[PDB]
Design a protein around this ligand. Sequence first.
Ligand code: OGA
Ligand code: MG
Ligand code: NI
Ligand code: ZN
Length: 331
Amino acid sequence: AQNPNCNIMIFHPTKEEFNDFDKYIAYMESQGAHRAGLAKIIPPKEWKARETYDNISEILIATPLQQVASGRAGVFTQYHKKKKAMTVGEYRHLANSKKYQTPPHQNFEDLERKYWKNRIYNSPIYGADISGSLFDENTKQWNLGHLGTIQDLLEKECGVVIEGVNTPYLYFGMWKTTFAWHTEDMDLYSINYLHLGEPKTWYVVPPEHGQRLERLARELFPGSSRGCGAFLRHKVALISPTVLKENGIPFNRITQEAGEFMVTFPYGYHAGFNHGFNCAEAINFATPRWIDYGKMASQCSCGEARVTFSMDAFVRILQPERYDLWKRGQD
Ligand SMILES: O=C(O)CNC(=O)C(=O)O
Ligand SMILES: [Mg+2]
Ligand code: NI
Ligand SMILES: [Zn+2]
């Protein structure tokens, strides 16, 4: 078995190897990359997502989210308070202000220490889930707005034709902005490209150990657990690496820098934070190996997680028994 310790792998495709996305994902899995839950892909040196970022300040963040924490430093929830719209130019200025800017630090490790020590005492503002793309239409390789769609994969593998579309989202982050412990909708893959700015640190649990994280989460968030049998779908819970180590949960960590892709694999729980002002783009995708994960994915039926138009069809076709009760939560 390849990569038995489930380490995060880093790949350096040639420009030749960068032409066929599906084939490269299948290559990575042949080397065991999926066992980690997360992989880094460094694009060939000849490749670019676009010519410059010089004109992005006029993108609108229509609903910036202020991420308010409750709990203790290593075990907390966050709630998202909606703020008034602002442009990317306004947001970047806010991120760079004395109140919100990255503090002085020695290196990534010192900054990670400061994050876990101090996150709960601040409420950074996150521009999340903004439909759009920053890839130039002329970028032909690994353009996240030109991937084959999940609906087309399900059609190719299973023969069923369904409604729905699949488009990318932009994320504008600042120091301490946080993504809570989650897997993707329907335990899909995700791919994330860091277009610009400061790094993003990721934590990940190997898919084969995801249930260990869920069991810990039920112990640490016991009222949330009683309210919903898949409460990590709410994307509100944080657990520090110290806490994970104290409870024996297998995990890994890695820092993504501007110009790098990350791929998350089906049922790979992940969480993380941003080091300072940045802009990432991400989208879900599928392969044939995903299908069985999609059939087994947990669902939130309490009604909090409230998810896309396209997820309907996935649940309807892959999880017909659940369909009924899931859509009671969604309506
Ligand atoms: O970048 C972020 O804030 C969150 N992204 C993801 O969870 C992802 O790409 O799967
Ligand atoms: Mg603009
Ligand atoms: Ni994700
Ligand atoms: Zn729920």
